Structure formats: structure tokens, C-alpha cells
Ligand SMILES: NS(=O)(=O)c1c(F)c(F)cc(F)c1N[C@H]1C=CCc2ccccc21
């Protein structure tokens with residue numbers, strides 16, 4: 001199936017998913033000098049007070065912390081968005097080395113990892129229906145650099161040994177995603193896509209300028225995960241990032257400067 005290697009990684013995805021060569025693919029390099037400050041953008045509103053995490057899950061490509069999105073709870077609005085987008089899950093992409101791992105880049109800089117908080121536009125009723133619309137999803141992307149530990153991340157890291165392998169899940173309740181946010185909500189935004197198959201062109205990307213710091217020990221725990229299932233040869237889950245794709249007609253807008 002698809003994955004991140006030589007014979008099934010990103011340069012192969014187009015054969016099963018021809019939109020991989022589409023007009024609004026993600027991620028992209030954010031050229032900060034070219035991004036246009038847009039004084040009409042609004043502050044983002046990230047309203048995570050009542051978020052209810054349910055499970056954390058390893059799917060063989062990443063791991064994802066899930067939320068109960070059956071009620072008007074943890075919502076993203078404002079910024080570039082029209083309407084209300086409800087948080088459904090977050091996940092990460094990361095590298096084998098601290099010098100790579102992010103999907104987006106900033107003036108060609110790669111971060112050690114990238115957090116994706118995925119939200120769906122409530123006007124489409126479900127995340128699945130939302131994924132068929134060109135304004136269906138909004139992903140808040142946050143870069144991770146290696147330095148001091150992020151305390152709010154540790155509950156996630158400490159459960160990973162219980163989900164080492166593809167298909168494992170754990171009861172993951174009362175996790176507060178506010179502990180994963182940097183101080184500043186300054187951002188870049190552009191229209192793009194899922195970064196994994198099926199690569200749907202359904203995402204408004206909102207990429208925060210300010211990275212969070214995680215410790216070397218925290219990211220080493222991500223790198224102990226496996227892309228295989230239990231009882232299969234160990235494949236470390238590392239380098240699960242799609243490289244930057246052509247910007248094509250698009251303009252990246254800045255909320256700041
Ligand atoms: N970056 S991503 O393509 O993985 C992503 C998006 F860009 C997006 F807009 C919505 C998503 F749900 C996902 N990630 C999930 C895709 C399938 C299930 C799964 C399992 C674990 C981690 C993430 C995801």
C-alpha cells in the first residue's frame with residue numbers, strides 16, 4: 001500500500017491518487033518574504049475549553065489523538081475561515097533526525113516535526129462529507145523544534161509504548177490540546193490538501209509562525225513507534241512527512257507584520 005519508502009513513498013502516490021499532481025497540493029514551502037500581510041484577516045479563535053479526547057490511535061502512518069466531535073465543543077473559527085470548524089483529531093509528522101520531519105517548510109527550513117490539528121466545517125455535518133468540499137477542513141499546523149520539553153505533550157508521549165504498532169489504540173481521555181499551543185497565534189494561510197492519500201483538496205491550512213519546543217527525549221519516543229503491526233518485522237515510524245509541493249497559482253497570506 002502507500003507509505004513513506006522508496007517504492008511506495010510520496011513520489012509514487014500519484015499513481016493511485018492522481019490529484020497528487022493537482023493544483024492545490026500540500027505541504028508547501030512558505031517563502032516568508034513573498035507571503036502577503038493581509039490586514040483583513042482576523043485573529044484566529046481557538047476555543048478548546050471543552051475538548052473531549054477519546055482515544056489515541058496508531059494507524060501505521062502516524063498516530064492520532066481523537067476527539068468526541070458529536071457536539072459543539074473544541075472549535076476553530078475566525079482567521080481566514082468562514083463559519084465554525086470542529087476539532088476531530090490531531091496527529092504528527094516527524095523525522096529520523098532533528099533536522100527534518102516537518103511537512104511545511106519556512107524559507108526552506110525543515111523543523112523536527114509538525115503537529116496537525118484537524119477540524120471540519122460544521123456546515124457539512126460530518127468530517128467525511130466535509131472532506132469532499134473545497135472548504136471542508138481546516139488544519140492548524142504547528143512546528144516542533146527540539147529544545148526544552150513541552151510539558152503538555154508528555155501525556156501523549158507516555159502512552160506511545162501502548163500503541164507501538166499499527167492498529168493499537170488506548171483510552172485516551174481528558175487530554176487538553178491547549179497544552180500543545182505556542183504563545184502566539186500569528187499564522188500563514190493558504191488553500192491546500194491532505195498530505196496523505198487520498199490527498200483531497202479540501203483543506204484551508206493555517207500554519208503558526210511560532211514553533212513549540214519539545215525535548216530530545218520526547219521526540220525519541222515518537223521515533224520508537226512502528227509502521228508495522230504486532231508480530232511483524234519492526235519498521236521504525238520515522239520520516240512520515242510529504243515534502244513541499246509546487247505552489248502553483250497560490251498566494252500565502254500572513255496574519256502579521
Ligand atoms: N496530514 S494528514 O494528511 O494526515 C491529514 C490531513 F491533512 C487532514 F486534513 C485531515 C486528516 F484527518 C489527516 N490525517 C488523518 C488521515 C487518515 C487517518 C489518520 C490516522 C492517523 C493520523 C492522521 C490521520
Ligand SMILES: [Zn+2]
Pocket residue numbers: 091092093116195
Ligand atoms: Zn498531517
